[PDB]
Each structure stands twice: as structure tokens, then as C-alpha cells.
Amino acid sequence: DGWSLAKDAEGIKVYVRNVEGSPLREFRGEVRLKAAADDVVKVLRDANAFRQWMPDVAASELLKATDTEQYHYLDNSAPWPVSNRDGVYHFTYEKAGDGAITVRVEAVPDYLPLRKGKVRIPRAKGQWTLVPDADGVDVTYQMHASPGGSIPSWLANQTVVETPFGTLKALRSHLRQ
Ligand SMILES: [Mn+2]
């Protein structure tokens, strides 16, 4: 597998695994929502709104959107008094033959110029997975980040579970509105 269950509470499961040559573990969060797949797609489209629910987001803006792709700008906070780091993210929406929806996620540091006063997050990578249930949708959120930002790698690793846990919990509360 490589994976191992790291947390299970409030209906959410988070898996982690080592990635060779990195000091940061990859996570995979899992939750099941009473919503349709395209209800989560809408929320993930509304990047201007990330800051409203998505944890540790100080600010967010949609830069560009097509049918299949999107770019948004984020200013990230942190659980500790460290400088904020910002970044541009590329989402790519794919609908598989079976109605499963995959949103491929990718940091793109050079899309906009550096905003100086701020550290630019280096490449990140992962995806959301949205697969319909009889009555809802099964949600996967998986990310691996490389070294960068204002939070020591050793610190981000020891706290890596709280990112998908906090995100999925907030996306659940948020869809309920
Ligand atoms: Mn299910």
C-alpha cells in the first residue's frame, strides 16, 4: 500500500505515506457527503470564495477559468505566527467514463510575478476525486508538497494530517449552506 490510516473522526479518514527523498508525507483525506458530485465541482470553481471556508486562506481570487481548467490566487495563513505564503494554483477538471470526476491540482509559482512582502509556495501536486454514491458523493483529497514556504518541513510533516481533515470538514459544513 504505502498508505496507513492516520486519523478517523467525525466521518473523515486521513491516510499518509512516506515519499522517498522527501521529508514531507503525502496525504489522502476521505469523506462522504450528502451532495452530488457537481455540487462539489461548483464549490471548487468558486475560487473567490475559498477564503470563506478553506482553512488558513487569508485571501483568494479566480484568475482564469475555462470549461476544463482554472487558475486562482491564494494568500495562505498558518496555525503559527510565521509569514504568510501565497501561490497560484492550476486545477484541471476531468470526467471519467463512469461519471467519476477528477480535479488535478498543481502549483504554478511563475504564473503571476512574485508579490514581495511574501514567500511564493513552490510546486505542489495532487487531486480531488469525486465519485457519485446512490445518494451522494465519495470525496478524495490527496496532496504532496515539496520543500518551501515559511514553515519548516519538519513542522509541516508533523501536522500534515490536519490539512485534509480541516479542509474536508469545512467543505462539508460549507456545502450544507
Ligand atoms: Mn459512498
Q: What Å distances lie between residue 91 and 16, 56, 105, CA to CA?
A: 22, 19, 5
* Domain encompassing residue 153: 1-177
**Structure determination method:** X-ray
Place of cell 489522502: 28
* CATH code at position 101: 3.30.530.20
**Which ranges of 67-161 would DSSP assign to H, the alpha helix?**
153-158
Query: What one-letter code names the amino acid at 171?
Result: L
Residues, beta carbon < 5 Å, ion ligand 1: 32, 133, 138
How many CA atoms lie within 13 Å of 34's alpha carbon, on the beta-carbon side?
4
Q: Which amino acid is at 39?
A: D
**Nearest-angstrom CA–CA distance, 144 and 60:** 21
CB environment 44-82: b (16+ within 10 A), e (fewer) = bbebebbbebbbbbeebeeeeeeeeebbbbbbbebeeee
Specify whether the CB–CB gap between 135 and 35 falls below 8 A: no
Q: How far is the CA of 27 from the centre of ligand 1 (A)?
A: 20
Torsion, Cα 37 43 47 50, to 10 degrees, reads -130
CA angle 55/58/112 to nearest 5° reads 115
For 88-109, the DSSP string reads EEEEEEEE-TTS-EEEEEEE-T
Helix 162-175 and helix 37-45, axial crossing angle in degrees, nearest 10? 110
How far apart CA 57 and CA 61 sit, in angstroms, is: 11
- Distance, CA 157 to ligand 1 centroid (Å)? 29
CA of 4 to the centre of ligand 1 (A): 20
| Cα-to-centroid distance, 34 and ligand 1 (Å) | 9
Number of domains comprising the chain: 1
Distance (Å) from CA 131 to ligand 1 centroid: 8
